[PDB]
Structure formats: structure tokens, C-alpha cells
Design a protein around this ligand. Sequence first.
Ligand SMILES: [Cu+2]
Ligand SMILES: [Cu+2]
Ligand SMILES: [Cu+2]
Ligand SMILES: [Cu+2]
Lengths: 620, 620
Amino acid sequence: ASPFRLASAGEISEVQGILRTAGLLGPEKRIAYLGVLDPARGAGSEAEDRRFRVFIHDVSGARPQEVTVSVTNGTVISAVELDTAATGELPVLEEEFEVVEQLLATDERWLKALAARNLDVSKVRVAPLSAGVFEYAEERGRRILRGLAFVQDFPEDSAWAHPVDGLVAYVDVVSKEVTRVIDTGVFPVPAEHGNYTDPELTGPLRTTQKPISITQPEGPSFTVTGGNHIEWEKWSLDVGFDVREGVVLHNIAFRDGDRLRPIINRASIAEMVVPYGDPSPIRSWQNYFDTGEYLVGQYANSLELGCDCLGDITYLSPVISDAFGNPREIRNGICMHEEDWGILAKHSDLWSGINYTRRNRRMVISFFTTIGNYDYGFYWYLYLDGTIEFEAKATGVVFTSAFPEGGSDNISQLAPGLGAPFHQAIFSARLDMAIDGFTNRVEEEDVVRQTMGPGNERGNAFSRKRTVLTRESEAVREADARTGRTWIISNPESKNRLNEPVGYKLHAHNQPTLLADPGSSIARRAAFATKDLWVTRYADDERYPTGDFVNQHSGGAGLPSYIAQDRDIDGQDIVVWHTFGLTHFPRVEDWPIMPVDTVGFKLRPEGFFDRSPVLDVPAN
Amino acid sequence: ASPFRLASAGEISEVQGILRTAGLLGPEKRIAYLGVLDPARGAGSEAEDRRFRVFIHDVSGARPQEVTVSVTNGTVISAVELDTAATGELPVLEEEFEVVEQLLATDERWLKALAARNLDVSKVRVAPLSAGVFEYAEERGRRILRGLAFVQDFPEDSAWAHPVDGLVAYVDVVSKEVTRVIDTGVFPVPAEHGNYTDPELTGPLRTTQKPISITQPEGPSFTVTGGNHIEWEKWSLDVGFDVREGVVLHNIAFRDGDRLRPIINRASIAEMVVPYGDPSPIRSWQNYFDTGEYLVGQYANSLELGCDCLGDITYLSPVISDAFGNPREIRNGICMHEEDWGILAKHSDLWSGINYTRRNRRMVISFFTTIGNYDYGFYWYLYLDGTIEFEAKATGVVFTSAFPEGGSDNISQLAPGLGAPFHQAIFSARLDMAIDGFTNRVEEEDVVRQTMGPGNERGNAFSRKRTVLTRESEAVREADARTGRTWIISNPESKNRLNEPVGYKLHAHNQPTLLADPGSSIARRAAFATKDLWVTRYADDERYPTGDFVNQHSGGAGLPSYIAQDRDIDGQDIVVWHTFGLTHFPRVEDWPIMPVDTVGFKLRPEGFFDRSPVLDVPAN
Ligand SMILES: [Cu+2]
Ligand SMILES: [Cu+2]
Ligand SMILES: [Cu+2]
Ligand SMILES: [Cu+2]
């Protein structure tokens, strides 16, 4: 049917059969990534050619491969071998994570570090994190994971409250060798528990909260057809899901009268980096590329009703592949519902005596994921008025350390002896623009202040200026909250009735971008996070700002290499990449579990419609 | 009962009698403003003295006065003659507004202008706007109103669709005299209607939206006692109402276990200016001071249940005084309710097997006001986790003009021949701080990037810096979204368990501030709007950023004057003044009636509590 429908279990099992038949999926092979490909731009597919891209890992040490399969025709369109030391390691496998603690438990260097701190190895949990690329030459080409320890005094104990600072071990997860055990010195291990479920910490629970029942007596106003095709209040789109990106939006279009007008071809969070700012050797290597290295969609929570999604929810249970190509379903991993959103438009006119009030509503599409100690919610919203917004919700338990006696300029104290190193959480939304079609262009709009004088004798005049970004070498922009900088995406060939190109305007939160030194490993690997806006000429292969392979990959791929092509983006098929994120200096209130914090962006019509598109909304 | 209770009709009446009996309320005297006074510093004198301040206008040109009455004593505490040419004019009376259109109808110059344009005078509506202070030397001491014409082809017609450009009249509403009629040129009067209630425009309405029912089967969780004292989820405060500011909140405090901890002593929007950036003499004088000149509380709407406020609402019907001292009730003028706010805290822990999830909630207190073409909503939100937030929603009909042939750099076209000049809507929240008491201080907190080298050899470290604002001469601060600049209010003598002074952090949106040339009239009259944050030493007479009489006030009134005293703000009773607004370049979809747009700010505890304050929230 629709070439944008969600991958079915049947298709995932067929991809496995095809790889197998092709001799690409023997016993030593592991699927490190599997996802359906989008229909080629023009006519690269005849009827419907469903293709899947796969990254195949080899547990014996053999070179991995990147394969594209046509589940329709039962063919392997391509299968190339990867030189991982050059182009990057494959995302970490779930199974490689549990390896680290196990190996460490019989390591004499490890055991001695633990003994020096009087810790029972059986109680020391190990957080296996991505390694990144640093000065360890023997790591080039190997799949390394670094482990940090936390004491878990008992079964239901949150070990995050008991970091074991001064110790870290590097583990090669393929050869199963502990490559290094670094012990800088003993630090008292914070003794206070942070068991937020323990009545002796919570105290008696609140009995003051009364119920709020949200209901929809006739069901929702949106319709789901073809499994993931949503139609709501003029809006039309397809909700997709990829194990790497999570919820992905396709064909966002608005039905303006007789015509269905496209707005965004595809929207997704293409990358998410969480860089740490503690300069201690125990943690200066820590950087979570949640999308690129871990694959956030894989860790998507099974949302419970009444708990995570309140109201009249319509759930999608996406299917992903496990390490062997078998399909596993993420039950209720995606929530869809509409929510009241206050007042849309209001005016009490004296002259006419007419009082007009209209309520707003928004369509929500979300999922929550867990990456170790942290949990994140991804929300996409569609409003009656044509506005599109995204919201990231950060929660979970903060990553801890010991708090250095004598304080720290890169670590905050949360409890006695317990520290929390500073970090950021930066996202990259990839917006494949289709404003009334693919012939688009982007303009940077700045407020313009005028001087008092001729033509502006009263000095009250203020204007705005718009600069067309004509080629990629000019499309890497930074925010300017001071001059109200925004970016407008227009279709220079489609005009409204006032003879102006239709458009949409991007409103960014203007938060600080990547703070790390420009010549740091992280600045190079997360070069996208150093600027707020990048615009590129659309290309089939330009999918992630960090490139296809982020794990233990240095710079060389991603946005910086795409941009170098210096292509024409003026009235062309373009893609907008927007960087936005939080900068976190943990506060005592974030412990022992962190209250939800948020970040995001939104786009609003800008001369797209010929007048307000909500003049037909009923009073009800 | 509580000295923060809402003014009763009986007290308004009692102020009227008291005034009359003293000879202060004659037949030519009008109450241009009346409001209850807050209990000053010194609670020991538990004898409740309910005082009311009043601004008395004299319709026959005689000097106005500022009268302070004591309703409990039954006496007039003070009465002062105001030199309006020095201290500025009193707020404009609703009656003076009407006068303008009537006076002009018989003015020959007016009639000739309408004649040249073939406009039927009985159809020409006039928008009586403030005059501000410009090159007109004969206006000093005179209370003027400037009129802009709009054609209303019929009663139900929206005259905003028909601006008569190139024409403006100045009227002395005291002497009932049209001092000027300027006709710069004939501009076509925009011909199409913008009647959003007309099916010929709206077209067939939507029958797609289904009902979302929001109920509280057992009632809300907040208790309103003493008429306006709210207690909800450990929070307690008193909801006040002033005809000038609208909703004001007092004694915002949080019950931390045993101890009821004060946070904000008083919160309000002490002002809101709407400057226009059209350089045409017809509008270059245009600047609304919704709060200072028109009094937003006066125009507060009666919020209907199920249209303006959805769910389990508890209304407050504030009472104000008309121009004669009679009490007037604004029925359902304030909405109070708690609404679900999604996820509060979440974490699925691998090691402990415990999956934890909590819902958030926000207490909402709001009101909506109308000022001519524009409508605005004020929302104060209190969150379970200790967060305080404010949000202003702008809607209504945009102020129009003729769209000049050849285009314009200061006006946008919304319809054929119809223009919408650029303007801003800038607010000022006044926060009388009481973080664990009155001994507070403010620090500007900036993110600090670090250079790679010794101590940061990996170039990953990043820190933060805090500069205490010690004197008022150092408390006029600007935004720096780039460096993630925020401001923290702490109590230097109330330390948390980690022995750090408790505090709250203000997060601004970093929107542009006043764009007007620094030397313009508006820059001087609304200097508050040129910077983002001001910190002053409390003083009971320092209530507004623009002063007590904004109407036709010369310049440098409020904040700039208070700040010049250069008081010690390092560990004192202090007030924070936060400037924030929207810069509006009207878009076609804002016509013919504009969808809501928002702006605001919030404060988050910063080491106020000893750990998360929401650990006692039940799973429900
Ligand atoms: Cu413990
Ligand atoms: Cu964080
Ligand atoms: Cu009309
Ligand atoms: Cu506006």
C-alpha cells in the first residue's frame, strides 16, 4: 500500500531470510541496525519498492557490512564491507553492554581497586558507555566500551547514588579483554541512598491530589488509515518509526480548500549528543550519542495508559529487529491523541458588539526512551493554526560522581559527598522541506533597528531584513536572540493572493550550543552542535548530521562534509538541520530523580495561507 | 479576615461616601483610578488598616488629586493636588474616549476629509488613542486623545478592515475641542470585509472536531479560603486584583515539610507597552500603555465556562469602581483551576528493576482583557516541582492602515490595499522577592567556556560564573542567550543542607527588547523596555516601571529614576523587574483575526529544597 507504512514483522523476517539466503547472515552475524528506506525522490521505485538498510556486525572480528535489501523483489541491491577504523564502528549492540561488568569481575586490577575501597565486587554495578575517539591508539578498529562503577547495596537500590570515583576500565567487547583499568585514587563512595520509592525518603505520600478525568465521548477527531496515516483538522501525514531516530514524520501537508498543500516532506531528530563537562580523567571521554551510537528507538518504553498517556490515546506498536534479524514489537511505544490547547482566537469588538472566542487543539505524537540513567520523551505537535512544534522532555536519574572536597567548577553537589558533573543535551532536527512542493529556499530574517533622522524623525521606526542563503557555503548559521533572528523557508514559485512567496518561519529557543573547545574530540565529532542552523541540498545519502557511523568515529563525515559541496539551495529541494539543546548544571532538586525539563523549536506559517486558516473552526 | 483579601463592593461604596463627605467627590469629579493598598512593612501592628488609593479627575480642567482613604477608620488619610504637566496626566476615562468620535462629526475639517474620500460620517468610527508627548507645546497640561478613522459599513461589520489612512485628529477631551485635523493625502480605503462571523468569509464550518471532556469527579485539589487564599499542593498564596495591573499574586510560599517558606512576596505585570514602528506622522505617535494609560483590569472580560475556561473552574469576581465611586463587579473575571501537565518524573531502571513514573500538574490563575482592537490573556502557573511561570497570550484584530503603493519597510500587507504596521508588545513583571524571607540578593549567572590545556587537556570542560549585583547602579542587566545567561535570587543567610544559600533561577525567553531609537520619546517614556532585568531596593512608592501617571508623561519616570538612588541590593529587601515581549511583523494569517501568540518567563528553584520536593507525589 502506502510506501510510508510502518515496517511489519513479516518484512523484517523476510529481510532476515534474504540476508541469510545471500549468505550475509550466518551464526557469527549480528544486526546492529535495520530500518526501512524512504521511497526515492522522483521515480526511483516503480509500483512500491520497499527497501531496508542493514548494518551487519561479525562477533568473530570480521569486517562488518552495510547492506540494502529489496524486501519486495527478494534481492540484495548492495552489500559493501566497512573499514571501521576509517568510517566508524557500528552502533553498540545490546549484548556488548552486559559483557563489561562480567569481564571486570574477574580482573585482578579491577578487583584490587575494589578491595582498596572495601567494596564487594558482587555489589558493584558497571555503567558501560561509548568510548569515543581519544589518544588510545590500540583502540582504532576495535569495539571498546568504558565502564564506571556504582555500588548497589541491595536489589532495589539505585546504584547511581553511590558512584565509585577515581576508577574507570576500558573493555574490548569483541575480544573480551579488559584493555585498561585506571585508578586515580580512592574517593569515599557516597553513602546516602537515593531510593525515591522508599517511604523513609519519600515520607508519607500526598493524599491531596484529586482526580482529573480527560475524556473524548465520541472518540478522537483524527483518523488512522493504512496503519500510520493520520488525518486531523486539515493536517495529513504518516507516522514512521526507525530504530535509530525513533518517531519520524513523513508528508506533512495541510488541506487548504480543494488542495492538499505539502509543508514538510520528512522530520526527525537525526542526532542527539550528551557531552559531559567534568575534566576528570575518569569522565572527560564521556559523550552519549544517543541517536547515533545507542539508537534511541531501540530503547523506547512501553507506555502505560493513565500513566504516560492520559486521554483517548491511539497507540502504535512499532516493530524493530533484534540482533538476529528476528522482529520484536515495542508494544504501545508510540502515543497519538489530540489535546485541548486553550484559546485559539478571541476578540470582543465594541463597534460591532460581536464577541468571538475559539479554542485551540493540538495533535500529539510521542514516545519515551531510556538510555541508562536517563529517560527522554520526544513530542511532535500539530496545531489547528498551521504551527508545527517539537518538544524534548529530559528526566531520569542524573549521572553522578564523588563531590571533590574543596568543591568543583565542573561538578555540582547533590548530597553529602555526591557530585553531578555538568553536561549538555543537544539535538538536531532534520527537516526535509517541501513548502508547497520541493522548490524551496531559506532566508535569514533579522530585526532591523532604524536611526532617528530624515524619514524617521520621531525615531520609532523599526524594520526587518531577509537574506536568501543561496549556496551551502552560506547556509551554516548561528542564532541571534538579540536581533530576533529567525529563518523562513519559502517556495519562490508559489505565491499567496498578495503576490508573495508562501513560507514557514522557524522559531528557535536560542539556547547555548556546544560549549567544548573547538579543537576537542567532541567538537569534531559533534560539529553539528556548534551551530544553530545548517541548510543543505537534498541528497539520498545525507541522512544524519554525524554521518551513518558515529560509534568511535572521528570527524570527517556529517554536515561539515555535506556543506563543502557548496550546492545551490536557492529555489531547490532543500533540507534544514536545526541544533537545539539544554545545558545542565545539576541542582539539588534534580536528585534523587530529576523533574522533567524541556527544549525544542516550532515553525509557523508565514504568508502560506491567504488569510487565517482557522476561520471555519466551530464555536461548538 | 486576611489583609490581602479582595476589595468588597461595600469597601468601594465606603470609599465613595468617605470621599463625598470630605468634598472630594463633586459633580465634575471622576474616579480615574481606585485600588486597595497592600499592608506595608510592619505586621506587628495587627490592627488591620484597609486603605484605598484614588486618583480623582476634574472634568472642568481643575487640578486632579491623589487621595488615600482608610476604609476601616472611615477617614481620608491624605489628599494631594497633582501638577499633571509635571507628574503626567491621570489615566484616560472610558467616557473621554467616546467624546472624540462625537466631536469630530461636526468638525468641518473632519467632514471635508471624509467628503474628499466620499465616506459617510455616520459610518466613520474613531479609535481614540493616547497622545504620548511629542513636539506639540500646547499639549503640556492638556489631556489629548488622537483619533484614527475606520469605516464600518454596517453594525455587524468589522471596521478594522477599513482604515482611512492619511488622516488623524487631535482632541482636547476636557475642553471638548478638536485641536487638529491632519490630512496627509487620500489613501484608498481597503474594500474587503474581514467579518470572521460571516459564512461568506468563513465558508462552511468544520464538523470534524469531537468533544474533549475535562472533569474532576471529586473536585479540584486546591482550596480557596478567605475568598482569595489558595492552597494547592504545598503552595499557598493570595490572589489579588487591581484595576491597573489585573491579577496580582501575594505571599507565594511553599510548605517544605513543617516550615512554610516564602518565595515571592508580590508578583504582577506592572506595565505593558505596545510601540508601533510605522514612521508615518499618521501613526508615529502611536504607543499603547495598556496597564499605565488604559488600566487592563478595567477591561477584563467575563470568562464563560466551556469557552474561555475548560474543566473544573473556580471563578473570582473582582469588583472595581466606575468613574463615580460605584462598585462594578467583573463577574467571572478570574479563572482558577489545576490542569494536567504530562510527565513529572520518569525512570525505568535496569539494575533495580523499578519503573517509576509520575504525572505533573500546574495551578492556573488567569484573566483576559480587551483594549480596542487587541485582546490579551494573563496566566500565572504554579507547578508541583516548585516552578513559577507567567504567560501572556495575544490575540484580537490587528491595528490596520492602508498598504502604500510601492510597498513599505514598516508595514505588512494583509489584504488587497490593507496594511498592518510593525509594532511590539513588551511587558514588565514586578517580582517583590522573598526567598525564605526578605534578605535576598541577585547574581547574574553565565555559562563559561574553557580553553583546552592543563586541567582541560581534552577540551571538554565548561563551567559557569555568578556575579552578585550589589548596588542598583549595577542591576540594569541585558540578556545573553548565547552564554545561557540567567539570574538567581538567593537568601545569603538561609543555607540548604549542603550549606549553600537557597535560591530561585529566572529563565527569560531572550526576545528583543525596545527597538525604538534610543533618543525617541517612547525610549524615554518606556525605558524599562530597553533592558531585560532591573533590580531595585524595595520602596512602597516604587510600584511601576513607568511611574504612577504614565499618560502624557515626559520621560525617565519609573525604573531609571528608582535605579538612580543606587541603593544596596546585596542581601536586602529587593524587587526584580523583568522586561519581555513580542516583536510583531503581521502575517497574512493574522487577518482577519489573529490566532494566539505567546511570551513569558519562569523561575525554578536553585537549591531551595534539600532534594526534589516531589518525592511524595503518589503514583495515582
Ligand atoms: Cu543505596
Ligand atoms: Cu542533564
Ligand atoms: Cu467591511
Ligand atoms: Cu501584534
